[PDB]
Design a protein around this ligand. Structure first.
Ligand SMILES: O=CN1C[C@H](NOS(=O)(=O)O)CC[C@H]1C(=O)NNC(=O)C1CNC1
Length: 258
């Protein structure tokens, strides 16, 4: 029944929908095109920030290390970094900016610190994720051309990895809580997965959008007096200049939580 609802939502939208939900109360999953590749876009910022968190486990004060911001660093979307031109920002400030305001400059500094996009992929292979891959920097990683395997993952792999990072033992206890704290304090996700959930629920999410009307959101949801949920909703359209469809993500969220 839930599978037929998710199918009808896709058919009526004319796009391609990717859903993976993990319920920790019974360890069950709800999957739709869960092994198909979808372009992550901005969502990829969770894996870049976590890579820096894992690095900081063995290097002392890393989130304190400062990084120079120049005007030539700036690209299409940098709401926080553009306030720091010819100043510095710590790796904590950049992590918080990438995750909570979706600053592409912050993400690029996080990518460059660990060694580049292939070095973020290497961090994903360390955790047991063999589908994730990062190839380019922001914003070119958002091109989301159908067929292109660059900067993609599957809904199943991301859901699994998100659980390991935010609830499981993939990072240290302090590092885990920090990511949770960052994702919970996001400002960008009110119209996406959150919109199809009850208002009172605590949510930590990372949104994303790009070419071909690609509309994305990955989330860990903590309902009061319940066990938490992990949800990945990835959507993409056939037309190159298609507008976003966040409402499809909210609708998919509702179908799978009630
Ligand atoms: O996916 C993440 N981002 C960063 C930014 N924030 O996305 S958000 O949707 O999570 O708020 C805006 C959309 C998207 C982005 O950078 N814009 N899209 C592009 O690919 C631009 C580069 N020329 C088109």
């Amino acid at each position: 029944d839930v599978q037929q609802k998710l199918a009808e939502l896709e058919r009526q939208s004319g796009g391609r929908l990717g859903v993976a939900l993990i319920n920790t109360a019974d360890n069950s999953q709800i999957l739709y095109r869960a092994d198909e590749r979808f372009a992550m876009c901005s969502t990829s910022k969770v894996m870049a920030a976590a890579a820096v968190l894992k690095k900081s486990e063995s290097e002392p004060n890393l989130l304190n290390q400062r990084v120079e911001i120049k005007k030539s660093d700036l690209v299409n979307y940098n709401p926080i970094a553009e306030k720091h031109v010819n100043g510095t920002m710590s790796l904590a400030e950049l992590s918080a900016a990438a995750l909570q305001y979706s600053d592409n400059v912050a993400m690029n500094k996080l990518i460059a610190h660990v060694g580049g996009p292939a070095s973020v992929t290497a961090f994903a292979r360390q955790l047991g994720d063999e589908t994730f891959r990062l190839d380019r920097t922001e914003p070119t990683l958002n091109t989301a051309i159908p067929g292109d395997p660059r900067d993609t993952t599957s809904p199943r792999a991301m859901a699994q990895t998100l659980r390991n990072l935010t609830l499981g033992k993939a990072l240290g206890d302090s590092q885990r809580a920090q990511l949770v704290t960052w994702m919970k304090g996001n400002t960008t996700g009110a119209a996406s997965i959150q919109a199809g959930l009850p208002a009172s629920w605590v949510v930590g999410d990372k949104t994303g959008s790009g070419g071909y009307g690609t509309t994305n959101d990955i989330a860990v949801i903590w309902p009061k007096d319940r066990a938490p949920l992990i949800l990945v909703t990835y959507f993409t359209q056939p037309q190159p200049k298609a507008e976003s469809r966040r409402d499809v993500l909210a609708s998919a969220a509702k179908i799978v939580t009630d």
